[PDB]
Motif scaffolding. Structure first.
Motif, PDB file in Angstrom:
ATOM      1  N   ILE B   2      22.748 -12.190  35.484  1.00  0.00           N
ATOM      2  CA  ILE B   2      23.006 -13.099  34.140  1.00  0.00           C
ATOM      3  C   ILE B   2      23.364 -11.965  32.878  1.00  0.00           C
ATOM      4  CG2 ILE B   2      22.768 -14.922  32.732  1.00  0.00           C
ATOM      5  CD1 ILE B   2      21.099 -16.009  35.000  1.00  0.00           C
ATOM      6  N   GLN B   6      29.154 -12.176  26.806  1.00  0.00           N
ATOM      7  CA  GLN B   6      30.382 -12.777  27.415  1.00  0.00           C
ATOM      8  C   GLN B   6      31.409 -12.869  26.418  1.00  0.00           C
ATOM      9  OE1 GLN B   6      30.129 -16.936  28.333  1.00  0.00           O
ATOM     10  NE2 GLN B   6      29.097 -17.696  26.246  1.00  0.00           N
ATOM     11  N   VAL B  25      25.354 -15.157  25.261  1.00  0.00           N
ATOM     12  CA  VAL B  25      25.410 -16.110  26.364  1.00  0.00           C
ATOM     13  C   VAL B  25      24.471 -17.323  26.006  1.00  0.00           C
ATOM     14  CG1 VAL B  25      24.592 -16.239  28.660  1.00  0.00           C
ATOM     15  CG2 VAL B  25      26.599 -14.656  28.165  1.00  0.00           C
ATOM     16  N   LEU B  34      23.381 -23.602  34.169  1.00  0.00           N
ATOM     17  CA  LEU B  34      24.236 -22.417  33.822  1.00  0.00           C
ATOM     18  C   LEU B  34      25.219 -22.237  34.711  1.00  0.00           C
ATOM     19  CD1 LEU B  34      24.369 -20.458  31.116  1.00  0.00           C
ATOM     20  CD2 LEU B  34      23.428 -18.586  32.895  1.00  0.00           C
ATOM     21  N   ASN B  36      28.975 -20.257  35.797  1.00  0.00           N
ATOM     22  CA  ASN B  36      29.946 -19.257  35.428  1.00  0.00           C
ATOM     23  C   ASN B  36      31.359 -19.470  35.447  1.00  0.00           C
ATOM     24  OD1 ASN B  36      31.202 -16.669  34.979  1.00  0.00           O
ATOM     25  ND2 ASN B  36      30.774 -15.861  37.060  1.00  0.00           N
ATOM     26  N   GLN B 127      32.919 -17.748  29.569  1.00  0.00           N
ATOM     27  CA  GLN B 127      32.813 -17.308  31.124  1.00  0.00           C
ATOM     28  C   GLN B 127      31.676 -18.012  31.531  1.00  0.00           C
ATOM     29  OE1 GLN B 127      34.250 -12.790  29.866  1.00  0.00           O
ATOM     30  NE2 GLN B 127      32.719 -12.964  31.479  1.00  0.00           N
ATOM     31  N   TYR B 128      30.566 -18.200  30.666  1.00  0.00           N
ATOM     32  CA  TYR B 128      29.303 -18.846  30.956  1.00  0.00           C
ATOM     33  C   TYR B 128      29.091 -20.073  30.296  1.00  0.00           C
ATOM     34  CZ  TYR B 128      28.002 -14.675  33.804  1.00  0.00           C
ATOM     35  OH  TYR B 128      28.183 -13.697  34.741  1.00  0.00           O
TER      36      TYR B 128
END
Ligand SMILES: [Zn+2]
Ligand SMILES: [Zn+2]
Ligand SMILES: [Zn+2]
Ligand SMILES: [Zn+2]
Ligand SMILES: [Zn+2]
Ligand SMILES: [Zn+2]
Lengths: 347, 347, 347, 347
Positions: B2, B6, B25, B34, B36, B127-128
């Motif tokens: 992780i 991001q 993030v 969480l 992705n 992205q996350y």
């Protein structure tokens, strides 16, 4: 016993002089019952049929009326479960064709070839009237036919409207004009169905009448500046169902605003020319449903009359003679006569 | 694994320049997963969150997006039925207080304290992204996450809209704009539900695309001068249900006329400022119901995604990188976007 | 304020001596509330949890009880919508995933991983008990917590059973054992829902009690030799719905026989080993439906408690101390107890 | 021209020799149509009427038959909606008084004075037969009257049975005996309604016929030792609905066991003397509903025939003359009849 001559109010020309003259007695058909009308209710639909405001053509000359109670004096040679001496009720739909999806589904009012009493078929403003045996309402024996005449239209309408609202026992129902003719019956039926009634009316002795017809919360719109806020505070949010007996466009707009999320607003009145212009965004976000309701079916009629027989629904009426119906029509056109008027066809 | 940094599209001011910069993030909460995000869909609701047209206040700075699919990379210390490696989908409703009247009946969208993705909570143009584990959609394993992204909003909406029409198998459903983005999915879902589809769209190669998605009757509004007559001739005497994917007032006004008696018209689009000004007489006599439909619930999500897995619903999509979303937004504001757009968060 | 030691009835072995000793106080989890039980109801399900008759394994040592009301003295760090000082009610279902296919449709009682109070989780025969905040019932403020304890199981059960019969207002409902503990609440709820109640019980002072709670017709099975005929004559052919609170096989057979055509018979009791061997021909020809009903959901809980608050449902119950529950259990195993028993956890 | 003499199979005594002799032609009543039966289906109900096993008394002498299609050659002087040359279908329920609780709500099969074809009224095992015009089925023009004869009983029954299961599109439906006469039509109707079909039948060439009818999963009970486990593994649990076309008691028991929680089991077959001795604990805990289904109503007839017209339901039939029905009855009593049999009344 069955005479050759009767008397009734007939208008030969649309918007003409309604005349009370001696007319020939109707002969029943194979599937028709001859009913000696004892009491007949007067409605605003009668004035509509007299003027010609609605789109359908009116059969002339015609005797009006669509809410008449009486005794089955004659029967056709095909009538199945009727007997001479039974109490019969003539309603708006005086029969239809039993061969299409609409009728087969129960919505026989949406039948392409439907007969209407006091519009396309001779109504109950006379002494002897014929009616389709299948559509005729079975009134229980031992009942005052003067008190059941008003429930043969108003009652069934409001009952079906609550069924269309789709409420559960313990839910809030807002009735606009709860201390009026169609509003009082609505309040009573909703109380007998297990719903919490919220009445929005304004006048003198209206709050008292509401509380005396099993009223929960009354909103006086003459003393209240914001009705939507009041309804949203009294019902911990909006009312699950809103029955609109008021034909005012402003009232229907406020109705869409003070209804609960995922709730239903039922339209009953039909002022030809009115528009329910409302915000679509609100309805789509709160998932509100606007349903239009017309006359009830045979099952609905039976159920509503059963409530009346139990004694949970009552209508304070004023009885006048059939010889005075012309002047009553004039006062109805002037918009002055108050109260449910029932006409005695005997005098 | 992780990361700590991001990249995503964030707008600091309302109606400002959308930027693609490195952002911190998000750390999951106790009941949050969480995810992705691998592929995210671009909707017209994102342009609204950018302008500030809707009434609710927007949390700034915020990354938009409400339809994103990806892999669960981390979960909180309370998440119950999720595992690391499972496919999850972020939707419009990103959680709610599971303690009230609406959140308990299923209408968790009408919750007073509801979190919306890309409006009140950081969305999936990142992205996350974090999401409530109870409201996250369970996407089956082995599915293309780029083709299931468009069905996480459009799909569920059309499905709940077809379930709000109260239709039976073999009944006629009219879809306005049947060859568009939402209309096409509507046609497919209705064909998979057993309904006869009638499409009303006008353009080049639209009739063919409609017949290719299992379409049964197509009305070209560009070659037809009277649409109501055409519908009432094809769908026998009217369509049992009408899904309005067209936001035009004229379209909905004609929709209330080509509906069958006792039928339902569903409103899905929400052009704030529009009004369904229709005749009340017609709705009350034919007993028509106008229902508004919003986002779907958890059960609806599960059912719609099951249809997609069986392979009865498909969406032709175009994949573009996330580094180019700043320009797709401008094309969407110019109104030059035609087909569905899915963004790859990897590039 | 929150103590470290409490007192409760715990059984270390199945079918062992129930003891009232000092036990450690439970610490709340992230989604759990710590409730100080003030009053707890004793049900026959507790005797079953003590014997081990049901199929699921019991967690030992365990403190029984599934109907307990009290004040929230502590909450977790994720609870949303609860406050310290609010009244909470522990029910049979005390935990779920709330992310499966039965937990998303409302039937969270059929969830694979469900926590039951007094069976899998420590119950409310204790001063301090923990419960999931999402499944805990919100009891209104200012209510006697001793009179709402019996309605946290019996009440919700009977209410959901009357909602599973699919009845309309004005319809007939036959309740077997209408003057018992689960039958009296049923009569009251059915009267508040707008149904006509017909009670079938036999004993001294039972007819009178039925007429005090609001019952219409009463059939004494000790003075009547044919019950089916009596019911079919009291109603117009049979009862639209039949709630079976009697666990006898003879009763359920007579129930399938005196139901109206197209009616529903609801089964509530669960004597493991009993069978409803009925004629299939009768059920198929008259289109009868036999539905089984279990505990109610969150929405059902809210609605039933709302009726209790309006004041339309009442339960005559006493208040014995918790130090005497060890002997009430023995009287319950001997089957010599009358009335609903409520235990005060303070004494 | 309507002849004065016709030919048909009549039995003077109950359980006597069925004879093919010349009989007088029936004259239509006021509400009856005179249909020239062209093709008639043979059912096991006819053998039942021949033996006298059912409780109702039969009208002797009588010509059996309840599924017959033909042309309307004559109508009464009240028939409203029919024309000479229209295709009509005689069903089990001929015509009843449209004036009680059973007629007005649609359940006209549960009427005190209901006329049944081949039991109380002369059936369709002749050349000319009379039928009530309101209960006669409207068969579309241009249809093979030999392929629509089997769908005038089996079809409507299975359709109403699948509508009584309360299933949604995408749900699992288990049909016991899916490769039989009443099972094949069930599979086809369920596939056309949007349901996933699971068939449980055992034999040679039955799996192939099931995969050719539109079946998804097939359980061979001859090669499978545990059917409940198989049905619980193929449907990620249990089937949402189970249509029992098998009359065995073992089958119906396994049916209550492999149904999903909150699911419905529909009973269609009627072996007078059988019983669903079943566990009550299971039904009450999983909230299962056992519904019984009989013949369908007018609306159901219309809908089922519409599916047949679209071409989604088909029945492989074998045509034989009416002069050979006396021997087909004996084969039916021996229980060696294969496929659905249709009789040509012309030869
Ligand atoms: Zn009227
Ligand atoms: Zn008709
Ligand atoms: Zn969207
Ligand atoms: Zn909430
Ligand atoms: Zn209990
Ligand atoms: Zn048959």
């Amino acid at each position: 016993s069955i005479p050759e001559t009767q008397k009734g109010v007939i208008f030969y020309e649309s918007h003409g002089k309604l005349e009370y003259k001696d007319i020939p007695v109707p002969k029943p058909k194979a599937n028709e019952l001859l009913i000696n009308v004892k009491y007949s209710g007067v409605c605003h639909t009668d004035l509509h049929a007299w003027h010609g405001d609605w789109p359908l053509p009116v059969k002339l000359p015609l005797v009006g009326g669509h809410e008449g109670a009486g005794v089955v004096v004659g029967m056709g040679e095909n009538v199945k479960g009727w007997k001479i001496g039974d109490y019969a009720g003539i309603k708006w739909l005086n029969g239809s064709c039993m061969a299409c999806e609409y009728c087969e589904l129960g919505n026989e009012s949406n039948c392409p070839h439907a007969d209407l009493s006091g519009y396309t078929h001779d109504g109950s403003f006379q002494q002897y009237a014929t009616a389709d045996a299948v559509q005729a309402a079975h009134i229980p024996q031992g009942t005052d036919l003067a008190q059941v005449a008003p429930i043969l239209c108003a009652g069934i309408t409001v009952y079906k409207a609550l069924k269309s609202a789709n409420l559960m026992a313990g839910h809030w129902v807002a009735i606009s004009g709860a201390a009026g003719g169609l509003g009082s019956l609505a309040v009573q039926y909703a109380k007998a169905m297990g719903y919490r009634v919220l009445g929005i009316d304004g006048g003198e002795g209206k709050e008292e009448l509401f509380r005396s017809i099993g009223g929960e919360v009354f909103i006086d719109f003459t003393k209240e500046k914001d009705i939507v806020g009041a309804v949203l505070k009294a019902t911990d949010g909006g009312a699950h169902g809103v029955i609109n007996v008021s034909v005012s466009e402003a009232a229907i707009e406020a109705s869409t605003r003070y209804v609960r999320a995922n709730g239903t607003t039922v339209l009953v009145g039909m002022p030809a020319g009115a528009k329910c212009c409302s915000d679509v965004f609100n309805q789509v976000v709160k998932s509100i449903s606007i349903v239009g309701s017309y006359v009830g079916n045979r099952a609905d009629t039976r159920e509503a009359l059963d409530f009346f027989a139990r004694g949970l629904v009552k209508s304070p009426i004023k009885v006048v003679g059939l010889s005075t119906l012309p002047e009553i029509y004039e006062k109805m056109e002037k918009g002055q006569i108050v109260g449910r008027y029932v006409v005695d066809t005997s005098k």
